Design an enzyme around this catalytic site. Structure first.
Site, PDB file in Angstrom:
ATOM      1  N   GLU A  59       1.612  -3.497  40.819  1.00  0.00           N
ATOM      2  CA  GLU A  59       2.074  -4.823  40.421  1.00  0.00           C
ATOM      3  C   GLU A  59       3.593  -4.865  40.299  1.00  0.00           C
ATOM      4  O   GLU A  59       4.219  -5.896  40.540  1.00  0.00           O
ATOM      5  CB  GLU A  59       1.433  -5.242  39.096  1.00  0.00           C
ATOM      6  CG  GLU A  59       1.723  -6.684  38.714  1.00  0.00           C
ATOM      7  CD  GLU A  59       1.757  -6.898  37.216  1.00  0.00           C
ATOM      8  OE1 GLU A  59       2.868  -6.980  36.653  1.00  0.00           O
ATOM      9  OE2 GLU A  59       0.678  -6.992  36.598  1.00  0.00           O
ATOM     10  N   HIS A  60       4.176  -3.732  39.923  1.00  0.00           N
ATOM     11  CA  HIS A  60       5.623  -3.603  39.825  1.00  0.00           C
ATOM     12  C   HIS A  60       6.290  -3.601  41.198  1.00  0.00           C
ATOM     13  O   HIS A  60       7.432  -4.034  41.340  1.00  0.00           O
ATOM     14  CB  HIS A  60       5.993  -2.324  39.069  1.00  0.00           C
ATOM     15  CG  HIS A  60       5.942  -2.464  37.579  1.00  0.00           C
ATOM     16  ND1 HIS A  60       7.047  -2.269  36.780  1.00  0.00           N
ATOM     17  CD2 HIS A  60       4.924  -2.779  36.746  1.00  0.00           C
ATOM     18  CE1 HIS A  60       6.711  -2.457  35.516  1.00  0.00           C
ATOM     19  NE2 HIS A  60       5.427  -2.768  35.468  1.00  0.00           N
ATOM     20  N   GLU A 136       8.382  -0.341  29.410  1.00  0.00           N
ATOM     21  CA  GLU A 136       7.459  -1.419  29.083  1.00  0.00           C
ATOM     22  C   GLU A 136       6.323  -0.896  28.213  1.00  0.00           C
ATOM     23  O   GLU A 136       5.698  -1.654  27.476  1.00  0.00           O
ATOM     24  CB  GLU A 136       6.910  -2.067  30.355  1.00  0.00           C
ATOM     25  CG  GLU A 136       7.970  -2.748  31.209  1.00  0.00           C
ATOM     26  CD  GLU A 136       7.376  -3.536  32.360  1.00  0.00           C
ATOM     27  OE1 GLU A 136       6.144  -3.736  32.372  1.00  0.00           O
ATOM     28  OE2 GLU A 136       8.144  -3.956  33.253  1.00  0.00           O
TER      29      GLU A 136
END
Ligand SMILES: CCCCCCCC/C=C\CCCCCCCC(=O)OC[C@H](COP(=O)(O)OCCN)OC(=O)CCCCCCC/C=C\CCCCCCCC
Ligand code: HEM
Ligand code: HEM
Lengths: 443, 44, 421, 101, 49, 55, 220, 41, 54
Positions: A59-60, A136
């Protein structure tokens, strides 16, 4: 013109399927803007021991450039058309979508199809997102609500795939390879398990045409067609208590096992959850709120906030509640909360659900305020129900709910069931699973 | 009917240290202030 | 079937009624009022804040009990959004129970009682509501910015000052509603309702005095420098000059310059390429940060500049770099394509903002309140891209020239003063 | 009627709480309603009520009363709490009715 | 962090029907609770006598 | 006030704070049982004694 | 000091010399009385212009010398008294640090009359810089100053401090007769010069109270 | 061994002469004592 | 806790019942018969015990 007619007069959602099995769905309006993306049936449940958090690592790297156009070009192209590119990944569902003008719809579909397929995965770029995700993680670790719900899954579905966090382990993020990432994408991001949804000023036929062009070749074997049947996840009447008295306020989540997306009881459980509702100290209604638990929370200062949830998955779910409270108000809060659970199974009145139904009606309608939330519903409805459920149909299911039914459904999933308990922070006042367990029967 | 709740400790008051999970917040407008009968207080 | 247009009626009062039927199963009615802390003086500071918290209190036609219980009985909701010089009272519900929730909405705005004991019991909520809003560091400097930018009106804080918590009288609430909640300052704006009904309601029930009531001393500019040292590892900082007001021709030029410099990433976890501000700073500093273009447009004034969230020791690098980007933008560094690319990003942002029910009702009611009309979205698309490239470089010139005001809170050990830019 | 109205004045004197310098609403038994109504009282009226009561208490332990001159007249008796108490009851009856719906 | 935290293996203490992690725990719920409650209900009878 | 009537009721309160919600060490053994034994044994002796004393 | 007291020798950590700013800090707290201070950069300790400011302080006037008494010598107290009606206090403010210093006025006044007092107090330094200083005013201030110094050293606190203050900085003690020389060797021009530096230099203001009528710094 | 104390918490003088003697003759000293009330000037 | 009258868990309900216990300033002799019944009970029990021993 009234409510009962403005539900049937909603433009039906069109569905068509390509050769490779990819579904295309659209809700056409007269919107100059639109939202269109791909909702994939992939998450952390599809992951395992060694590729945990790979789909999150992916997703990054989704927006970090593709094969046809590298990072610099891709970002510059998307920004220039005033288009917003966003996405997420859950435990059972990944999505990548774009907000843009209705005119850029075909170009958008091309941009979408490029990311899901021809992702770059630059070896140098991966190494940067190593530290990015690792930051994160440290960031999300200070979100007490986040930590609690992860702990809830970790113990409720302990020993299964659903017990894993979406982001994955530190070791996994550390050591995940480009091969591992590329493997995830090829293994999971496949046409039949993907849904191209759109909503706005978009012609459905034009949509499936641009989709037919950029969403590509047919699978050869039967293996690449079939949609996988995930192994079941075992619920465990259990608790996990992560204690930290230096933590300002404590978080507690308690849940029983849910029914799953398919079950029609999920509607009643949402009606029941609407009765108890939610609260935080900024609710202006105060002591006069209809929700009994909220009223008791105000009268006795039981908590900073509490919420009820019915998180559904493919074959299971998590019916429960979560609250934030001061170190010395936990036990009284938990007491009242479990009391209202019993009140659901035992005493639920028609007057209560007549309100709850009205709230749930207003809720599902508010859920579709915009193009993105309509696209989100559509991309998920197909992926979970196999079809679109119009607000007209939802209303029919909801309007059939009465007090006698809420009592039965709740007594079925709540009464005398061994719940799952996640508790984080200064948590002395709340203690012993046996006491919590005894709070599951007799109002 | 929607919106997420919150709560902090007073007397002294009560997720923003990245480049991206802290991003999206840097004042575009000025400062709106919301409060509701049954929905969490908001701010822009 | 079909979708018929929006109607507007200006009552004998001066009251504006902007309605629009969209056949959505959810109605959303609001009451837009020209109130706010802008009309506060040093005697009654915070009375605008306590006022919006006083919505569920007893009224002359509905108890504090029946307001909350009656609205929740039909799945409806009541909320009060307000800026420094605007106040909106919103209600959402199903199409059926409009009239039901419409009662409580009308009772709250046009007939509060402000019972002394209810007011007194509500006072300590100011502490709570302020404490949770102030959890985001931005509202800290944003309130300090207005304090350092002006001398009155807009200089007044949006959230009630600490020293006046519990010291707001029940009469001050009464006086504020009497002086500001007047017919020629309000607008009954609805969505998912027929205009003939919304008009009938506004006539059959709105009685609070006509005219303009209390006016506001126009915002005198200051140009101050407010700095808060609180040791937070992250330093927030804002630097603005007097921007542009609403309706002004100069306003559109600043909004385009905003997107030229760049205002918030359009891609999740993505770098900003179009943003000359984000990029220009990225060349100067090493570590993670955020630097966006800041632009506010008020009735009689406005602010424009940049906001930089950066690390402590790298605050100096980011702030100076962000400054140079506006210098270079004023020195001509603006491509004709950059304008058209920004004019595109802006026309986009506007359009998808009106997707939501909140965005649509607000956008309609905002204009219907000030200039009692609703501009066709095609003409607002005309007024924006009719801005030259010179207009943009001109707006940048005004920043580098005009007197600056700065607000910054964090560990300001390496944060530059305003006379160092 | 004025017949029942004269009966009033008789009972007020026969009661004799005016001998202690007490208003009629001073002698009100503080149930849940009266307690709430009392909290709504303005500071001045509350601080005055407090003194009158403490004075009556001090008198009672002395087994004395106020001089005839300082007795509260029937026509001079302030029903200072009764308007508050009526609304407290009105509000409660609403909730009790609204909760049986 | 907290992502690095998992629940230990309780197969050493688990009952027979909840031993398998890919098997529904609910189908055998009434069976497990019915036994322990039977023991309790019997002890009540013996006490009552 | 207090929510339930187990923490409130001045009779049920010391019934609660002695035999219900009373905090006890997690690891006390069977050697800690003889306290409650003496208690029951006392109530037993008193009852059996009363029945004997009536004759 | 020697056969007991030691530890780390040398000069150790030094200080970054005071950079001037010129800011405007305002606190709104609704107090009926408004305090306000307006200063520019003064003179450091042991400076040439050090004595000149101290004399200008007593010329303008620094705190009443008579219990419950009006201040006649004080041109600042008197000059403001002509402008406002109600009770107040307005004195001359002067600090001397090692590498810098502050000089100006401090006005405690009523809320709505803060504007009157502050502006009036400002004009007194303007008029003092425009020449409004009698040769007698200097000698009268140089007298008030020589007095204040002398009776301050009566106390044990005052004596030990005065000795230790100088012994710390310039490792000597100055004979009280010579400190009496260094002060009245200040001209009348030196005083009007010190006043000139105030009206010219960049001002910095701090004020806390109900500042509803308290003027900003760019209004003086 | 001398000097008067005070008491306050966290978490008038309105006549020209009874509140006179305050306007900072110098600026601001800060005294604290082992056995004497915390001084302030 | 300074003194050992407010501390001592035995002396503290002795204190909070017969020493520091807040009582109305104006209760009359009709409030005496409570403590009378108490003493009378302890008297009857003592005289009864002495009789029962014979
Ligand atoms: C003769 C038969 C005697 C049987 C006694 C059984 C009994 O006393 O149990 C009472 C009660 C059980 O209550 P809970 O299940 O915790 O309550 C949940 C909330 N209602 O507590 C006991 O078990 C006491 C005996 C040990
Ligand atoms: C801790 C409490 C008590 C203890 C330890 C105790 C102990 C004893 C013992 C050792 C005997 C001798 C009996 C025998 O060996 O034959 C006895 C007898 C007796 N006790 Fe108790 N007793 C207790 C309580 C009571 C009470 C409360 C009563 C009456 C109210 C009572 C009434 C009697 C009578 C009537 C007898 C004669 C019957 C007999 O001798 O068996 N006892 N007791
Ligand atoms: C509230 C407590 C008591 C009351 C009201 C009470 C009352 C009485 C009365 C009315 C009699 C009748 C005597 C007569 O009229 O001739 C009596 C007798 C007697 N009582 Fe009690 N009594 C009390 C306590 C006790 C106690 C605690 C004991 C022993 C422990 C006791 C032992 C006796 C005996 C032995 C007699 C017989 C002597 C006689 O008849 O005079 N009493 N009691």
């Amino acid at each position: 013109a009234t409510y009962a007619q403005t539900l049937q007069n909603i433009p039906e959602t069109n569905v068509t399927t390509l050769d490779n099995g990819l579904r295309v769905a659209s809700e056409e309006s007269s919107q100059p803007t639109c939202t269109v993306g791909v909702w994939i049936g992939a998450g952390s449940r599809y992951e395992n021991e060694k590729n945990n958090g790979a789909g999150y690592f992916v997703e990054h790297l989704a927006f970090k450039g593709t094969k046809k156009r590298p990072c610099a070009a891709f970002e510059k192209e998307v920004e220039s058309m005033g288009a917003h590119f966003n996405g997420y990944t859950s435990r059972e569902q990944t999505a990548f979508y774009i907000k843009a003008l209705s005119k850029d719809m075909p170009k958008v579909v091309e941009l979408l199809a490029d990311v899901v397929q021809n992702c770059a995965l630059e070896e140098s770029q991966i190494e940067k997102e190593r530290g990015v995700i690792l930051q994160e993680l440290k960031e999300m670790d200070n979100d007490m609500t986040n930590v609690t719900f992860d702990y809830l899954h970790a113990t409720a579905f302990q020993g299964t795939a659903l017990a894993r966090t979406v982001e994955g382990t530190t070791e996994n993020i550390k050591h995940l390879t480009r091969a591992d990432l590329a493997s995830y994408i090829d293994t999971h991001f496949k046409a039949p398990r993907m849904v191209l949804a759109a909503a706005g000023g978009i012609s459905h036929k034009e949509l499936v045409d641009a989709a037919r062009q950029h969403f590509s070749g047919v699978s050869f074997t039967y293996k690449e067609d079939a949609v996988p049947i995930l192994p079941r996840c075992r619920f465990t009447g259990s608790e996990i208590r992560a204690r930290d008295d230096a933590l300002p306020v404590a978080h507690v989540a308690l849940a029983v096992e849910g029914p799953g997306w398919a079950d029609p009881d999920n509607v009643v459980l949402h009606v029941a959850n609407a009765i108890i509702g939610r609260y935080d100290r900024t609710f202006g209604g105060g002591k006069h709120l209809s929700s009994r638990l909220a009223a008791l929370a105000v009268e006795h200062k039981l908590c900073h906030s509490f919420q009820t949830f019915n998180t559904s998955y493919s074959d299971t779910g998590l019916f429960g509640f979560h609250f934030v409270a001061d170190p010395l108000s936990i036990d009284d809060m938990m007491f009242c909360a479990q009391g209202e659970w019993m009140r659901l199974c035992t005493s639920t009145t028609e007057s209560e659900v007549k309100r709850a139904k009205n709230h749930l009606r207003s809720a599902m309608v508010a859920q579709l305020d915009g193009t993105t939330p309509v696209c989100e519903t559509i991309g998920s409805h197909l992926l979970n129900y196999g079809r679109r459920i119009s607000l007209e149909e939802w209303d029919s299911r909801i309007s059939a709910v009465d007090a006698r039914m809420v009592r039965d459904v709740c007594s079925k999933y709540i009464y005398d069931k061994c719940p799952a308990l996640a508790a984080v922070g200064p948590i002395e006042q709340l203690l012993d699973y046996n006491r919590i367990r005894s709070g599951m029967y007799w109002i | 009917x929607x919106x997420x709740x919150x709560x902090x400790x007073x007397x002294x008051x009560x997720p923003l240290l990245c480049r991206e999970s802290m991003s999206g917040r840097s004042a575009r407008r000025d400062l709106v202030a919301g409060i509701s009968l049954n929905a969490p207080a908001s701010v822009r | 079937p079909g979708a018929e247009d929006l109607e507007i009626t200006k009552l004998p009062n001066g009251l504006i009624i902007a309605s629009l039927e969209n056949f959505s199963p959810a109605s959303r009615i609001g009451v837009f009022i020209k109130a706010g802390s802008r009309y506060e003086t040093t005697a009654n500071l915070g009375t605008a804040h306590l006022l919006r918290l006083a919505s569920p209190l007893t009224t002359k036609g509905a108890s504090s009990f029946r307001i909350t219980r009656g609205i929740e009985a039909v799945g409806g909701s009541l909320s009060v959004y307000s800026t420094r010089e605007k106040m909106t009272y919103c209600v959402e519900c199903l199409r059926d129970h409009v009239d039901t929730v419409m009662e409580y909405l009308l009772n709250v705005t046009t007939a509060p009682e402000f019972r002394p004991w209810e007011v007194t019991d509500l006072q300590p909520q100011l502490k709570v509501d302020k404490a949770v809003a102030f959890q985001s560091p931005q509202v800290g400097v944003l309130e300090n910015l207005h304090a350092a930018a002006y001398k009155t009106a807009l200089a007044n804080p949006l959230y009630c000052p600490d020293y006046r918590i519990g010291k707001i009288t029940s009469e001050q609430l009464h006086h504020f509603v009497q002086n500001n909640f007047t017919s020629a300052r309000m607008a009954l704006v609805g969505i998912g309702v027929k205009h003939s009904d919304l008009k009938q309601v506004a006539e059959q029930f709105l009685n609070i005095r006509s005219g303009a009531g209390t006016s506001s001393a126009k915002a005198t500019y200051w140009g101050g420098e407010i700095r808060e040292q609180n040791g937070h590892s992250l330093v927030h900082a804002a630097v603005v000059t007097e921007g542009a007001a609403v309706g002004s021709a100069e306003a559109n030029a600043f909004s385009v310059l905003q997107h030229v410099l760049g205002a918030g990433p359009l891609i999740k976890r993505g770098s900003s390429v179009t943003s000359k501000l984000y990029q220009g700073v990225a060349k100067a500093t090493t570590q993670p940060f955020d630097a966006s273009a800041f632009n506010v447009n008020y009735s009689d004034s406005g602010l424009f500049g940049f906001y930089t969230i950066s690390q402590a020791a790298h605050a100096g690098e980011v702030i100076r770099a962000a400054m140079n980007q506006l210098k270079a933008a004023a020195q001509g560094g603006v491509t004709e394509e950059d304008v058209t690319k920004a004019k595109n990003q802006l026309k986009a942002t506007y359009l998808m903002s009106v997707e939501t029910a909140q965005g649509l009702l607000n956008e309609i009611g905002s204009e219907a309140l000030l200039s009692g009309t609703h501009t066709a979205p095609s003409v607002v698309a005309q007024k924006i891209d009719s801005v030259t490239s010179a207009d943009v470089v001109n707006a940048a010139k005004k920043f580098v020239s005009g007197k600056k005001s700065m607000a910054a809170s964090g560990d300001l050990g390496s944060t530059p003063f305003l006379d160092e830019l | 009627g004025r017949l029942m109205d004269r009966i009033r004045k008789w009972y007020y004197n026969a009661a004799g709480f005016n001998k202690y310098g007490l208003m009629r609403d001073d002698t009100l038994y503080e149930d849940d309603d009266v307690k709430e109504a009392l909290k709504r009282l303005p500071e001045d009226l509350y601080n005055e009520r407090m003194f009158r009561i403490k004075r009556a208490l001090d008198l009672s332990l002395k087994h004395r009363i106020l001089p005839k001159e300082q007795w509260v007249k029937y026509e001079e008796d302030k029903p200072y709490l009764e308007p508050y108490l009526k609304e407290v009851i009105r509000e409660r009856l609403e909730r009790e009715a609204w909760n049986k719906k | 962090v907290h992502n690095d935290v998992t629940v230990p293996d309780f197969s050493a203490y688990r009952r027979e029907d909840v031993m398998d992690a890919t098997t529904s725990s609910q189908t055998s719920s009434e069976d497990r609770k019915g036994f322990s409650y039977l023991v309790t209900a019997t002890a009540c009878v013996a006490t009552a006598y | 006030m207090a929510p339930n009537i187990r923490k409130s009721h001045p009779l049920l309160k010391m019934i609660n704070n002695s035999l219900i919600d009373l905090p006890a060490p997690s690891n006390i053994s069977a050697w800690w049982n003889f306290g409650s034994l003496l208690a029951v044994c006392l109530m037993t002796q008193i009852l059996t004694g009363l029945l004997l004393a009536m004759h």
